[PDB]
Design a protein around this ligand. Structure first.
Ligand SMILES: NC(=O)c1ccc[n+]([C@@H]2O[C@H](COP(=O)([O-])OP(=O)(O)OC[C@H]3O[C@@H](n4cnc5c(N)ncnc54)[C@H](OP(=O)(O)O)[C@@H]3O)[C@@H](O)[C@H]2O)c1
Ligand SMILES: NC(=O)c1ccc[n+]([C@@H]2O[C@H](COP(=O)([O-])OP(=O)(O)OC[C@H]3O[C@@H](n4cnc5c(N)ncnc54)[C@H](OP(=O)(O)O)[C@@H]3O)[C@@H](O)[C@H]2O)c1
Lengths: 486, 485
């Protein structure tokens, strides 16, 4: 029995329509078929969602660790039971290929399972003090209410990466998902957590335009933390509100980044090309960790830029429901326009085209470019699409200066048969994550996930998640009269 | 022999005059006498300090932990050798009581000593991976260049609390001190670290008007991290630039907090009143931790008030250089004017005046108001002064609502003889730190230090300092080829 009545949004403990009087139509990117229609959430709905989350969170925190962990374990069972249902929703709503939808399902399933162990793992500290009679204590407790903003690209995994740890550690959450993917934005995650036995009021979804309710979501005096994943222009506005607005709160910001792919002269050129193809065209380039630009040492550029285009030509563009589809449709119209503008600017700027696939409706084929410079737009800005530019490098020093020439280092990759040469290069990269002899699209559950420069505030996953979604309360207890100088 | 030529600032590896063309006069708040004159730094000076710091930092980080720790240990020796000179500087520049200046010297010494252990403690992680043939490495490294903005109230301690951990962990630091206290704002510390053997260009001090160069200081692309301790309006502007600016960097914020001091009915009255007097009137009230609200259960309220007022009358407002003096001059006239307005506003609000002390030049005697309510400005806003309001609570539950009814919660105190009830109450407090049967003003090098709500972003000291001033880099190495679908 598949979930029905998806349009109703969990709001302050009950499933009801929003009161904005405005409707959001959720459509399939591939064919345009309407999937459902949602009565959008109000500013009063948001205040109610937060207030109820505050009211029922202490009861959730007061539950013992096994009780909260049981909900997370039960959530894993549902993930298995509704596996095709979950994957099919990812495909139809976000326009993900079937094979990406399976990868996203497994990533979200893994962080849920990983989060289940967190109630047993978190602990406080007992500290020795010089003051006679003074005992110093630190309690580790849940923040309270976590507001979570979710992007369209990987809407399920990226929402679940915040709320699954946050809920396990005794927080309550309010999710504001992307308007293009409100269902895989935690509307379904809310349904899954309800099935898992999550008490009502701890998980609320507010569906509305981030340009209209977003400021109120981050400004709100209730949430102690706001996590975000998306664009740098919006992440900047979110940070400026949360760190400069009326009510201050922490922020975890994962801005998009500009993953460089560095192929040094002594690289295994087959491995490099295969990694470059998969690490670019998984999800049609719509990944924050997708490689943005490929930088090959000159003594190997032509070999790479030739085997690269060979294999790019062999990627099947088409219907995402098929397991053999590599490239599916682009998520919406404006995003497709922005990538066609980028292709036109790459010609305007002199980049030699090596392959122009077509554009068939919402299906945009790969568009490879070579002889690219660091100042070209296709190299400097983040492309959430099947666009790639190839950059020629002389010395490895030039590979390193080219790779660091981006303002946001999130992830990166460097290829060389000499592992020590590759690690020293990777230590020189101003990015939070580098993968040697592998793709930059990686996210293991015990591994720190976050950015540096203009793409990152904070770290997720594992012990980094336990620290992110809790707070430390220093409590000193004086067991004897302290003598004061006046 | 004592430090001379203290107006020269360390910019880009050289001690030189600022290029701004405006001269800054540093004057004793108590008498108005001039300590020294500084040629202020312009934006070109700021660019040079950041650029040199980024240039010399990798060689500093490349050095072993013992070498960097050795500089921290030698700096502790300078702290002991120049102890009286440091305390004298704090008294004259900042208007501090000698007793507070000794406290600040001790706290700054401890942070410097504690940081010396940090280079040995930093470590990376090796993590198991499901992907076959893949080894996952997490490298902990220095951030790079750290920008530090220091307030005037505890300039030497609050600068060193960021400076000493960052330097020990391999970072380079650029410090913008409060214009009222540039010498104890890091000019003194830069001399101390130079004497300790810190290489040139690793530590720069930029002295300029906050309205003139402050935005450029936070805006700059070089610093990986910016730390601020000070007022909430300025912290909001710093947070708005760093989180929202063209170049994005982490910010650690310490913003002034209305700190609740709660006296429950069973509390030992002598201890509470003594803690309230010392907690409030240490350094004339100009502490982030200092009490802003005293909340007492109604049963004990009237008894607490009389003891507090009677004790406050005892405190001597006087020349800060004397050991016996408890209340000293307000740091500057602009600070004094606002406190006088807050006093007058509190009468307009309808608070009963329990004690009204004189104002004589910069010295402002204690002012105590009673029957305060939460909506009043004296309770609502933090006051960096010898001003306190007393609030009446019907029961323990009402006291909890009063204590938590604050936009910002840095520190708190709860007094009750029953420790379980006090700790239970303490957990409910919306603060980073709570002290049970003790003053709210407490800083411990091992203990975490920071604020909640509109009072703080980030934590300081101990393992928190190690996390704050280092960045983790996840590097995964493929030893066997991995298949791609
Ligand atoms: N993971 C990543 O790094 C990542 C992810 C997605 C996109 N991007 C980049 O961003 C671009 C796409 O931009 P976009 O138009 O889709 O927006 P976006 O920044 O991708 O939006 C992400 C989320 O933020 C919301 N949002 C938008 N304005 C907001 C505001 N003022 N306050 C709060 N939330 C707000 C959106 O909700 P509404 O839809 O209701 O506004 C959405 O749920 C692409 O160029 C791509 O490269 C990066
Ligand atoms: N300052 C505090 O620690 C504090 C704490 C609690 C309450 N208050 C309240 O706030 C008032 C006093 O505040 P204040 O203005 O004297 O202290 P402040 O300016 O907040 O001092 C903090 C530091 O920030 C600098 N600064 C100012 N504008 C800046 C900017 N745009 N960017 C970067 N740095 C900037 C200041 O340098 P300059 O000195 O060169 O301007 C100073 O070194 C009083 O009403 C008091 O009750 C203050």
């Amino acid at each position: 029995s598949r979930y029905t009545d998806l349009g109703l949004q969990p709001l302050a403990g009950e499933w009801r329509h929003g009161r904005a009087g405005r409707r959001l139509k959720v459509s399939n990117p591939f064919d345009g078929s309407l999937l459902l229609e949602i009565e959008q959430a109000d500013r009063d709905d948001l205040d109610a969602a937060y207030a109820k989350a505050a009211e029922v969170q202490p009861a959730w925190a007061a539950l013992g660790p096994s009780a909260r962990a049981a909900v997370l374990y039960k959530a894993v069972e549902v993930f298995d039971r509704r596996h095709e249902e979950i994957v099919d929703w990812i495909i139809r709503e976000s326009g993900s290929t079937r094979l990406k939808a399976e990868i996203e399902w497994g990533a979200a399933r893994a962080i849920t399972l990983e989060s289940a162990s967190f109630p047993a793992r978190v602990h406080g500290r007992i500290v020795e003090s010089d003051v006679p009679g003074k005992e110093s204590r630190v309690y580790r407790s849940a923040i309270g209410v976590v507001g979570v903003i979710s992007p369209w690209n990987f809407p399920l995994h990226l929402t679940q990466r915040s709320i699954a740890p946050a809920l396990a550690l005794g927080n309550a959450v309010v999710v504001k998902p992307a308007s293009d993917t409100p269902v895989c934005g935690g509307l379904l995650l809310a349904r899954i957590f309800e099935e898992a036995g999550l008490p009502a009021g701890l998980f609320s979804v507010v569906v509305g335009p981030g340009s209209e309710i977003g400021d109120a979501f981050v400004e709100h005096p209730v949430p102690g933390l706001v996590t975000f994943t998306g664009s740098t222009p919006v992440g900047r506005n979110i940070g400026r509100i949360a760190s400069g607005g009326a009510h201050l709160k922490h922020v975890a910001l994962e801005l998009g980044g500009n993953s460089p792919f560095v192929v040094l002269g002594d690289a295994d050129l087959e491995q490099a090309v295969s990694a470059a193809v998969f690490g670019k065209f998984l999800h049609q380039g719509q990944i924050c960790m997708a490689i943005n630009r490929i930088i090959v040492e000159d003594s190997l550029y032509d070999a790479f830029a030739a085997r690269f285009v060979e294999r790019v030509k062999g990627l099947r563009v088409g219907d995402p429901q098929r397991a053999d589809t590599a490239v599916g449709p682009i998520v919406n119209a404006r995003q497709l326009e922005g990538l066609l503008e980028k292709i036109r600017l790459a010609r305007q700027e002199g980049a030699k085209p090596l392959y122009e696939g077509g554009v068939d409706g919402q299906l945009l084929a790969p568009h490879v470019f070579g002889e690219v410079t660091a100042t070209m737009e296709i190299a400097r800005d983040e492309i959430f699409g099947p666009l790639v530019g190839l950059l020629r490098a002389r010395d490895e020093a030039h590979a390193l200066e080219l790779a660091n020439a981006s303002e946001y280092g999130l992830s990166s990759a460097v290829f060389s048969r000499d592992l020590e040469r590759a690690v020293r290069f990777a230590r020189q990269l101003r990015a939070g994550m580098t993968h040697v002899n592998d793709i930059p699209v990686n996210d293991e559950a015990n591994a720190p996930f976050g950015g540096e420069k203009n793409s990152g505030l904070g770290r997720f996953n594992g012990d980094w998640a336990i620290e992110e979604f809790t707070t430390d309360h220093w409590i000193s207890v004086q067991h004897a009269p302290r003598q004061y100088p006046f």
